[PDB]
Design a protein around this motif. Structure first.
Motif, PDB file in Angstrom:
ATOM      1  N   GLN A 136     -20.878  -2.356  49.819  1.00 51.89           N
ATOM      2  CA  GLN A 136     -20.880  -2.819  48.521  1.00 51.89           C
ATOM      3  C   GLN A 136     -19.763  -4.024  48.513  1.00 51.89           C
ATOM      4  O   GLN A 136     -18.911  -4.268  49.402  1.00 51.89           O
ATOM      5  N   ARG A 164     -16.998  -8.308  51.005  1.00 56.54           N
ATOM      6  CA  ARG A 164     -18.044  -8.812  50.583  1.00 56.54           C
ATOM      7  C   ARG A 164     -18.196  -9.154  48.959  1.00 56.54           C
ATOM      8  O   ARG A 164     -17.084  -8.576  48.074  1.00 56.54           O
ATOM      9  N   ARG A 222     -20.256 -10.416  45.413  1.00 56.61           N
ATOM     10  CA  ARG A 222     -21.749 -10.676  44.762  1.00 56.61           C
ATOM     11  C   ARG A 222     -21.700 -11.652  43.848  1.00 56.61           C
ATOM     12  O   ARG A 222     -20.935 -12.103  43.336  1.00 56.61           O
ATOM     13  N   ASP A 223     -22.929 -11.905  43.336  1.00 58.75           N
ATOM     14  CA  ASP A 223     -23.099 -12.956  42.317  1.00 58.75           C
ATOM     15  C   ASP A 223     -22.968 -14.364  42.981  1.00 58.75           C
ATOM     16  O   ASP A 223     -22.354 -15.132  42.290  1.00 58.75           O
ATOM     17  N   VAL A 224     -23.640 -14.322  44.064  1.00 56.90           N
ATOM     18  CA  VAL A 224     -23.393 -15.643  44.722  1.00 56.90           C
ATOM     19  C   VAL A 224     -23.660 -16.981  44.034  1.00 56.90           C
ATOM     20  O   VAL A 224     -22.944 -17.891  43.982  1.00 56.90           O
ATOM     21  N   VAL A 235     -22.066 -10.924  51.721  1.00 58.08           N
ATOM     22  CA  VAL A 235     -22.140 -10.670  50.659  1.00 58.08           C
ATOM     23  C   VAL A 235     -22.608  -9.305  50.183  1.00 58.08           C
ATOM     24  O   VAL A 235     -23.074  -8.453  51.203  1.00 58.08           O
ATOM     25  N   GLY A 236     -22.872  -8.834  48.837  1.00 54.63           N
ATOM     26  CA  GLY A 236     -23.370  -7.577  48.623  1.00 54.63           C
ATOM     27  C   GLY A 236     -23.886  -7.633  47.321  1.00 54.63           C
ATOM     28  O   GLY A 236     -23.944  -8.596  46.499  1.00 54.63           O
ATOM     29  N   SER A 237     -24.712  -6.633  46.831  1.00 58.15           N
ATOM     30  CA  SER A 237     -25.401  -6.471  45.489  1.00 58.15           C
ATOM     31  C   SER A 237     -24.719  -5.688  44.646  1.00 58.15           C
ATOM     32  O   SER A 237     -24.847  -5.493  43.404  1.00 58.15           O
ATOM     33  N   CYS A 238     -23.817  -4.522  44.993  1.00 58.17           N
ATOM     34  CA  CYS A 238     -23.247  -3.494  44.513  1.00 58.17           C
ATOM     35  C   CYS A 238     -21.915  -3.637  44.227  1.00 58.17           C
ATOM     36  O   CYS A 238     -21.111  -4.154  44.901  1.00 58.17           O
ATOM     37  N   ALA A 239     -21.628  -3.164  42.986  1.00 57.11           N
ATOM     38  CA  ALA A 239     -20.268  -2.816  42.540  1.00 57.11           C
ATOM     39  C   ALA A 239     -19.512  -1.877  43.479  1.00 57.11           C
ATOM     40  O   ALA A 239     -19.996  -1.008  44.001  1.00 57.11           O
TER      41      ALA A 239
END
Lengths: 231, 232, 232
Positions: A95, A119, A121-123, A138-142
Motif C-alpha cells: 500500500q 510507497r 500513489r498518484d504519480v 509506488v502503490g495504487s492503494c491507500a
C-alpha cells in the motif's frame, strides 16, 4: 541563511563534507530512494518535519500530520522498522502511504518537498503539481487497512541496505537530488564549518575536472586536491 | 461498456473501490511492476488472458500462447511460485520471457497490453510499437534453455513483496498506469456497484483537491466531502 | 573490426548468438544494470578493461585504474563477491565506487563507456559529459571508508540474481543497451562465427516481424524463417 547556502550544493558535495569533516563513513546518505516527482531545479533542501507510521492495530492514535507541514520543510515519512527490509522494495507493505492530495496540501503550505521511506500513489498528480517527491516506490492503494500516522516531529529509524539503521531527527537538514537523499544531523554539526569546507571542496573539485579536461592524469589531479584539502 | 468506464479510472481509483466496497486490504494491487513500455493514454484496461510458465523439464508440454491472444485482453504472464521471490528482481531467472515479436503479434490481435511477472526483452521495439508492457524488469536472452509456457487461461499465483500470494483468474479485469497494476476479481464483484462507487469517490476527491487549493485543511475537506460515500 | 561489427547488434541479438551457437543458457547476460547515463546511440560496445574493488582492510594496495583506460574499452568495475547480493540493491555498501571525475578521464581517453557492478555518484555529470554509464544504482558518498580498487585487467566474478556466479575477463566484448549488458567471452567463443550467425539471425527476425504484420502466426513464421539458421 543555512538553507540558502546548502541549496547551492549537490548531495555529493554535502557527503564529502560529512565524510571528511565529521568522519561519517556513509556521508549521511539514505540510499535507494527515487525521485518520482523530480525537483524542477537542481536539488531540494529543507528542515525535516518527520512523520512515523505504524500498524493500524497500534494503540497510539492516528495523527493529522499533513495540515501542519511547515514552510521550507522537507516532509519525511517512515514506517516502523519491523515493516522495513534490507532488500528492495525496502518495505513490507504494498500500500501507498502518501498520495496527491497530500502533495497538494504540503505545496499549499510551501513545503520544499517530500521524502517517503515507502510507497506513494498518484504519480502523475505530484508531477502535475511540480511538487518534489522522493520515495522507495509506488502503490495504487491507500494505507487505511494497514498503517496510520502515529507521530510527528519524532525520531525516525531507517533500516538501510548496508544493514545499519540510521536516524533522522526533527529539524535535520535534508537534501535530495538525482544522486538521492542526504541528511545533515543538526545536533551534531557546526553548519558554518561544514559549509566552509564544502565551498572549498567544490572549488578544488572543479579544478580536478579542468585538470583532466586539459590532459593532466587523474592521479596527479587528485593528489593535488588532497594536498590542498589537507589544510 | 464497463471496460470503457474502467478505462477512465486510475488504478488508485479502482483500488479505492476494491478497498472500500469489498474490504480488500491491498485494493487488488500487484506491486513492483514497471511500465517499461508505457500506455499511450493514461491507463490500459482489459480482460486477463493468463499464461503460466514452468521449467523446461516439466512434463506439461510447451504451449503457443501468443497466437491466440484475444482482442481487448491484457496478456498476463507469470512463473510458477517456486521461481518467484519476495525481493527484487522478484524472479529467479535472468532470461526474458517475452520479446518484441510477441508484442508485434499480440498487438496485431488487438490486445490492449501485456503484464509480465518476469522480464521482457527488446525494450525499444515495444516502445516503437507503442504497445503497453509492464514487467518486473528486463533481459537480453530468450527463455528456451530454462522455461516454457505450459498453460493458458489458468489461475496465476503471484508471490508479492508483502509475503502474500495473490491470484489472477482468466477474465479478471486488469488495469495499469504509472502507479502499477490492479486486478478486479470478476467472479466476486458486482461491476456496476463497483463502477458507481469509484465514480463517486473520484468526484469526492476532485472536490477535496479544489478545497485544499482554496486553503481548506485536508482533514476538514476529506471529512466533509467523503461523508456521502458511505451510502454507496 | 570486431567492434565495428558488434556495434550494429542489440544485446538481444548477441544473446541469440551465444545461446544458439554455444548453448550458453543465459546468453551472456549480466542482469539488473540500469543505464543511468544512457548511450547517445542505440548501444555501446567495447573490449573489457576490468577493475576489482575490495574492502579497504584487504592486504592488496589501492591502485590507480583510471589513467590507463584504453580507447574503445568498456570500463568494468566490480566488488569482491562477498560484498555482492542476489537481491537488489545487489551490493552491500551504500557508497558509490565511481564518480564524475572518472567518466571525465575515461572520456578523455576515448573509452566507449562504463559498467559498474555497484553504485555511481554525480549522476548529472555523467549525463552532461554524454558518457555512457550502466550501474546497479546510485550513491552520494565516496568509497574511501569502505572499498578500494585493487586490480586492473583481472577476472571479475559477478554473483548474479539467479544465484550463479558469472565471470568477465579483460578483452571480453561488452555490449550495453536498453535491455542491459551482455558479455561475449572471447576465450570460449569464436567471434567471426558468432558475428556471421547474428547477422543472419537479425535478417531472419526482420522477416518474422514482417510476416506477423501480414497476419501470419508468430510461431509458424519463426519456425519457417529460422529454418535457415539450423545449418549454423
Amino acid at each position: 541563511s543555512d538553507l540558502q547556502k546548502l541549496q547551492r550544493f549537490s548531495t555529493c558535495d554535502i557527503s564529502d563534507g560529512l565524510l571528511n569533516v565529521y568522519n561519517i563513513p556513509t556521508g549521511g546518505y539514505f540510499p535507494n530512494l527515487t525521485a518520482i516527482s523530480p525537483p524542477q531545479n537542481s536539488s531540494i533542501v529543507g528542515t525535516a518535519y518527520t512523520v512515523l507510521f505504524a500498524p493500524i492495530d497500534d494503540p497510539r492514535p492516528a495523527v493529522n500530520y499533513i495540515d501542519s507541514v511547515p514552510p521550507n520543510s522537507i516532509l519525511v515519512l517512515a514506517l516502523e522498522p519491523h515493516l522495513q527490509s534490507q532488500f528492495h522494495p525496502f518495505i513490507k507493505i504494498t500500500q501507498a502511504m502518501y498520495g496527491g492530495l497530500m502533495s497538494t496540501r504540503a505545496q499549499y503550505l510551501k513545503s520544499n518537498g517530500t521524502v517517503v521511506f515507502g510507497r506513494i500513489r498518484d504519480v502523475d498528480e505530484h508531477r502535475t503539481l511540480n511538487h518534489p517527491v522522493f520515495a522507495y516506490g509506488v502503490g495504487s492503494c491507500a494505507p487505511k487497512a494497514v498503517v496510520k500516522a502515529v507521530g510527528t516531529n519524532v525520531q525516525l529509524k531507517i533500516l538501510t541496505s548496508d544493514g545499519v539503521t540510521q536516524t533522522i531527527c526533527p529539524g535535520d537538514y535534508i537534501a535530495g537530488d538525482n544522486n538521492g537523499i542526504v541528511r545533515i544531523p543538526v545536533q551534531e554539526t557546526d553548519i558554518s564549518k561544514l559549509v566552509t569546507y564544502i565551498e572549498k571542496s567544490i572549488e578544488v573539485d572543479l579544478l580536478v575536472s579542468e585538470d583532466i579536461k586539459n590532459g593532466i592524469p587523474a592521479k596527479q589531479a587528485q593528489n593535488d586536491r588532497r594536498s590542498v584539502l589537507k589544510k
